[PDB]
């Protein structure tokens, strides 16, 4: 069933004509005002941007000739009674020809011509936002009437008037009393009157245009009050400025424990600033990137592209980049190659910065780790490439047996002090270092003369098993090492073995004797012990025993096992409770108990009849 | 002070001119080619849409003529040797004037003009996709040159050739041998040659426009083979093709246990189908394969979540001819229509689950055992109380007044409760065997009030966040006990003084309870439900303690043993007291990681059996 109608039989017959592409301006205005911007409030964000652009242009016109610089400010006025919003700038302005060519032509931007006329592309090319030519028409999203008083900064220009109802036709005229620059009056729509309120305009400006290059006033009072410290050199910004900027961006009243100021240009233009907070991460921090994109000092509002890896969501800051590709809606182009390389560069930069911070201050980095280790663990368990795995794992800090309590150690320094030819890193998980030292697995492991890391946090063995390799050395837990590795009389021991296997057949698939234990009555070993511990939390007792294979081990030298010999015959009934309690204790010590609430009654009725002789 | 430069001294004196808006097409083509579509592969989809539109138009023309319906289909050809991609449709076709008017004008679409001549808006408006007029120029994102051989369906129109290199200038000519319809040749760019491979084109076609209303062929073979069953009536669609469609959309191989066909027009045009898989939810499950469609083409928003987060366990498709779209044919983020669609879908799915529970007790019970965690998550993440109660109506629990194995909802629980009673009691335990023997349940065995039993995790949190059902508060058994208002008194006080001395740091307050029969001790806190989960979170993630009141049972043998134990083995008596406190904390669920308890238990047991 493979048939096609594709053929090359067609050919040109008549003389070829020639035509020029046209454009339906009415439908273009409809598209811009209805089906371009998801958020209705961006119209001022464009306009303010335009204002800044104009001012930037004026600065060039006052730098090339080297003359005096008058006041350069942007003004927002709100008239609830008239239902209007006014955006005024003292920038270059626009003449008759400039108003007709720029305002009257869709996708025609005077900024692009201005940038191409710089002949340097180093002063205003990085500070001009307008690049499409449709930003102004977003004003028609909310306005049934746009009224522009524009006059140029040229010595002898005239005030000019520009009315448009947004219906594909606009009128122009000569106006008197117009101040140098451009003042746009927007008459709000019936349903868009909410933009004729002080609070809404203030919210939008603090959402989009806080860090414009020029002072910005709303209804009379300046509302910027905070320069963008991510633009100048890191040496020129102080600790107080860093703290204030962190307080603004993170919406928190504390200070940043870590500050990074990255400024790179060889791979791509990145001016980023990041802060790791002093306070412990909050519950909101764990839930999902807390870093705001900026392009020419205006917000992008991605909120979905994740310019920063998810595990690095605990840091707060900004990223500025003039190279990112923006769509017509002035939003980030999803799944862009440039944004992916930006994310990778930022991730590697932050990993390197954390490594240098660890080298610089041991105690401060130890505090940072005990605060934010869950994020690095999540990054390890969620990464794909082994290089990223190792880079994040270099940030881990686990205290080991070879060092005193409370002295955390890295994986790299642990590997730097192993034996000559052992490619094995051993880790043991316990709630506390005291239990780790007194863990049955560690006591069995004491036969081997090696150093073992101690893990106390949740999802830590899971992190180590996901890492699975560091510095070309395999990661094997103590339980896994015990499994993979290959008093009482013999007759009494064997008969006790048979009795326990008979009375624990359903729950234990194999019982054996371990002479490596000294202070623990019993041990539980599993093939994939680390994987089993995590799987048990994801998915009566025989149900888990089927897929767990709880290999039980007993120590004949322990007091309970020794007393079991007389407890099996004198009162065989209590011996069943005793061995069940020993099995449950070994289960709990192994971490293979979903909830110990079931064994409480068994333990209580063991205690009531165990010490009744007293 | 305030510094403002806004004034009103300005005035108009000049003559008012009049101009028409212009648009330079070079920058418009540039914007469409680079800064419009995030994905480079969407262009064929647009082309396919165009093809579909053309075919649709032709169909309507034949409806206007009442003549025989010829074969109409979309053919896709891929030439890796020539590095070209061709899309041919047998639609209406375009004349030279039509080619110039439509192809040569930005934002000018013949589909809208055709719709304005429909005068019914139901015959073809539900199937016409083109609405902007820039879809064709997406072909320039990948093409260094585009040819269009178009012959109109009119009886006597000649073929026309349309060349464009995408630099704002295009040429037209008379073409001979062109069959009826439109054949678009695209010569791929140097860096965009991946579209000259059959595999990539097939993947993109199946991803975006697999459910086009007309047959679609790539390199000769047809890959539709499956009609859009969400458009036909629920009675017409059968179970076999229901299973086939579910397997396609969910990329699974099982059958759907629940199938919902929702079709409404009064609030907004919704044609959706939803499937609940037979298998238990996967770990990845915990766009959710509910991808939004519009005029039988994928929107691929992947961010708005047209369906609530907890309703991610269901698969299927949603179609709406009225959802607003970006110029890039993407969903408008945070739109009122989309939010109302999400609310309507959530309400309809809640109603459907309620109806399924009414019409099948055991099947819905199995489904709840399979997907109860999603409803609990929805209750946890919900904000409106009415939504909270609507989702809670889906919860199934087993109570103390009913035999083991059967589950009931909160509605039928409150239907059988006493009129004077105005609260719902719930107790959390891993199994019903432990719940019946739980010290907290035994404490309320004095009263006859029914109590629900919760086994799965996060049920206590779910009932806590619910906090009300049918204007009835939800009070946990532990909370009810704490809010409530053989070891003679002197000996009991003397023993309790020592217990306070040895448990001063841990047990903030200790008292005697008279409602225990089998459990030596109990641990209670005011925020028991909240604390039991806050402790789990604290031991789970290091993010940003409690005052446990301990109650002893005077009639218990273990507690009675402590008087004679203190005078003989004070150290072992202290060990027993610590073990009793640990057991009470474990039963309360407030215990930490119990690995530390094992050592103390063994140190107790080594000497507690030194009497045989």
């Amino acid at each position: 069933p493979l048939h096609s109608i594709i053929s090359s039989t067609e050919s040109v017959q008549g003389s070829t004509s020639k035509h020029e592409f046209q454009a339906e301006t009415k439908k273009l205005l409809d598209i811009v005002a209805r089906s371009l911007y998801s958020e209705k409030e961006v119209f001022i964000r464009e306009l303010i941007s335009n204002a800044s652009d104009a001012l930037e242009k004026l600065r060039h016109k006052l730098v090339s000739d080297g003359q005096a610089l008058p006041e350069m400010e942007i003004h927002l006025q709100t008239n609830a009674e008239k239902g209007t919003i006014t955006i005024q700038d003292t920038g270059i302005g626009m003449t008759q020809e400039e108003l007709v060519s720029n305002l009257g032509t869709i996708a025609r931007s005077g900024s692009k011509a201005f940038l191409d006329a710089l002949q340097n592309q180093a002063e205003a090319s990085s500070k001009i936002i307008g690049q499409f030519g449709v930003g102004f028409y977003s004003a028609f999203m909310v306005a049934d009437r746009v009224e522009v008083y524009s006059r140029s900064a040229a010595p002898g220009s005239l005030g000019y008037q520009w009315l448009s109802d947004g219906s594909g036709v606009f009128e122009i005229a000569e106006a008197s009393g117009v101040r140098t620059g451009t003042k746009i009056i927007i008459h709000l729509k019936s349903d868009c009157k909410e933009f004729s309120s002080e609070a809404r305009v203030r919210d939008v400006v603090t959402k989009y245009s806080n860090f414009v290059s020029f002072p910005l006033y709303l209804n009379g009072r300046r509302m910027n009050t905070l320069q963008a410290i991510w633009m100048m050199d890191p040496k020129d910004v102080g600790e107080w400025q860093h703290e204030e900027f962190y307080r603004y961006v993170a919406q928190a009243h504390d200070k940043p424990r870590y500050t990074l100021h990255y400024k790179t240009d060889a791979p791509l233009n990145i001016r980023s600033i990041f802060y790791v907070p002093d306070m412990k991460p909050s519950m909101f921090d764990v839930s999902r990137s807390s870093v705001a994109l900026y392009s020419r000092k205006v917000l992008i509002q991605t909120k979905a592209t994740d310019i920063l890896p998810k595990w690095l969501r605990f840091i707060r800051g900004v990223v500025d980049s003039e190279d990112i590709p923006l769509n017509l809606s002035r939003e980030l182009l999803q799944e862009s190659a440039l944004i992916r390389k930006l994310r990778d560069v930022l991730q590697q930069r932050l990993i390197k910065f954390f490594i240098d911070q660890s080298k610089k201050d041991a105690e401060k980095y130890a505090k940072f780790f005990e605060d934010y280790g869950l994020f690095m663990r999540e990054g390890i368990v969620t990464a794909t490439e082994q290089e990223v795995k190792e880079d994040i794992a270099k940030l881990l800090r686990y205290e080991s047996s070879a060092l005193p309590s409370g002295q955390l150690t890295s994986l790299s320094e642990y590997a730097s002090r192993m034996r000559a030819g052992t490619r094995n890193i051993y880790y043991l998980c316990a709630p506390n270092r005291h239990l780790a030292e007194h863990s049955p697995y560690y006591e069995a492991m004491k036969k081997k003369d090696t150093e073992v890391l101690f893990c106390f946090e949740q999802f830590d063995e899971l992190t180590l098993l996901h890492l699975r390799e560091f510095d070309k050395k395999k990661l094997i837990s103590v339980e896994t090492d015990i499994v993979v590795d290959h008093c009482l009389s013999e007759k009494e021991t064997e008969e006790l073995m048979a009795w326990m296997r008979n009375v624990l057949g359903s729950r234990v698939t194999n019982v054996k004797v371990t002479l490596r234990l000294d202070t623990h009555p019993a041990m539980v070993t599993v093939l994939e012990m680390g994987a089993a511990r995590h799987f048990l939390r994801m998915q009566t007792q025989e149900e888990r025993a089927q897929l767990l294979q709880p290999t039980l081990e007993i120590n004949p030298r322990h007091a309970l096992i020794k007393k079991l010999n007389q407890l099996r015959a004198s009162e065989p009934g209590l011996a069943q409770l005793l061995v069940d309690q020993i099995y449950e204790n070994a289960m709990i010590a192994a971490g293979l108990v979903d909830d110990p609430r079931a064994m409480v009654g068994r333990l209580n009725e063991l205690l009531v009849k165990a010490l009744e002789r007293h | 002070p305030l510094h403002s430069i806004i004034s009103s001294t300005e005035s108009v004196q000049g003559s008012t001119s009049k101009h028409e808006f212009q648009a330079e097409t070079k920058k418009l083509l540039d914007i469409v080619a680079r800064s419009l579509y995030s994905e480079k592969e969407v262009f064929i989809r647009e082309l396919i849409s165009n093809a579909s539109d053309a075919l649709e138009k032709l169909r309507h023309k034949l409806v206007s003529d009442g003549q025989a319906l010829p074969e109409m289909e979309i053919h896709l050809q891929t030439n890796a040797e020539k590095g070209t991609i061709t899309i041919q449709d047998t639609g209406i076709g375009m004349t030279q004037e039509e080619l110039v008017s439509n192809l040569g004008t930005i934002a000018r679409s013949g589909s809208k003009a055709f719709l304005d001549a429909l005068q019914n808006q139901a015959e073809a408006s539900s199937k016409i996709i083109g609405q902007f007029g820039v879809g064709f120029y997406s072909a320039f994102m990948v093409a260094d040159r585009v040819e269009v051989y178009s012959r109109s369906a009119a009886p006597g129109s000649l073929g026309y050739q349309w060349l464009s290199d995408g630099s704002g200038v295009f040429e037209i000519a008379e073409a001979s041998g062109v069959r009826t319809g439109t054949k678009i040749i695209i010569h791929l760019k140097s860096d965009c040659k991946e579209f000259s491979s059959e595999a990539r084109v097939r993947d993109v076609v199946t991803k975006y426009s697999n459910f086009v209303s007309f047959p679609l062929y790539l390199n000769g073979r047809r890959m539709n083979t499956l009609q859009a069953i969400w458009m036909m009536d629920p009675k017409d669609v059968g179970e076999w093709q229901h299973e086939e469609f579910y397997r396609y959309v969910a990329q699974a191989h099982d059958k759907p246990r629940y199938t919902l066909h929702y079709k409404t027009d009064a609030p907004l045009n919704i044609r959706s189908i939803f499937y609940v898989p037979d298998m238990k939810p996967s770990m990845f499950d915990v766009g959710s394969s509910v991808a939004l469609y519009s005029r039988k083409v994928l929107i691929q928003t992947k961010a708005t979540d047209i369906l609530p987060k907890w309703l991610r366990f269901i698969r299927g498709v949603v179609d709406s001819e009225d959802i607003p779209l970006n110029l890039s044919r993407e969903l408008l983020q945070e739109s009122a229509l989309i939010r109302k669609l999400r609310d309507v879908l959530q309400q309809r799915l809640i109603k459907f689950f309620i109806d399924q529970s009414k019409k099948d007790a055991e099947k819905y019970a199995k489904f709840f055992e399979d997907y109860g965690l999603f409803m609990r998550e929805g209750i946890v993440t919900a904000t409106e109380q009415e939504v909270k109660e609507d989702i809670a109506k889906l919860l199934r629990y087993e109570s103390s007044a009913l035999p083991s194995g059967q589950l009931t909802s909160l509605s039928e629980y409150a239907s059988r409760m006493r009129a004077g009673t105005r609260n719902i009691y719930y107790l959390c335990a891993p199994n019903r065997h432990l719940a019946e023997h739980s010290p907290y349940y035994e404490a309320m065995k004095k009263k006859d009030t029914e109590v629900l039993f919760c086994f799965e995790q996060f049920d206590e949190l779910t009932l806590l966040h619910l906090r009300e059902f049918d204007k009835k508060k939800l009070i946990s058994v532990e909370t009810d006990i704490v809010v409530d208002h053989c070891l003679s008194e002197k000996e009991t006080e003397e023993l309790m003084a020592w217990m306070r001395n040895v448990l001063g740091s841990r047990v903030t307050n200790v008292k005697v309870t008279l409602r225990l029969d089998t459990h030596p001790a109990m641990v209670t806190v005011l925020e028991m439900g909240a604390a039991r989960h806050f402790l789990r979170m604290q031991q789970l993630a290091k993010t940003q303690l409690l005052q446990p009141t301990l109650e002893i049972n005077p009639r218990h043998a273990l507690i009675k043993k402590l008087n004679q134990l203190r005078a003989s083995e004070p150290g072992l008596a202290q060990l027993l007291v610590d073990q009793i406190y640990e057991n009470a904390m474990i039963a309360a669920g407030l215990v930490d990681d119990p690995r530390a308890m094992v050592g103390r238990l063994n140190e107790l047991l080594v000497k507690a059996l030194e009497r045989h």
């Binding site: 519950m283 909101f284 764990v286 839930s287 368990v381 969620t382 098993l465 996901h466 699975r468 994939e528 994987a531 995590h534 799987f535 994801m538 | 770990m283 990845f284 915990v286 987060k309 998550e377 946890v380 993440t381 996060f458 949190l461 806590l464 966040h465 925020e527 439900g529 909240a530 989960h533 806050f534 979170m537 993630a541 993010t543």
Partner: peptide, 23 residues
Amino acid sequence: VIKDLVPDLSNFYAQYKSIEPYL
């Protein structure tokens, strides 16, 4: 198999936001 299960633990803040009003 288990390593690739990538446990979600999503809406992890919502549970604490639920807990807050009770206390």
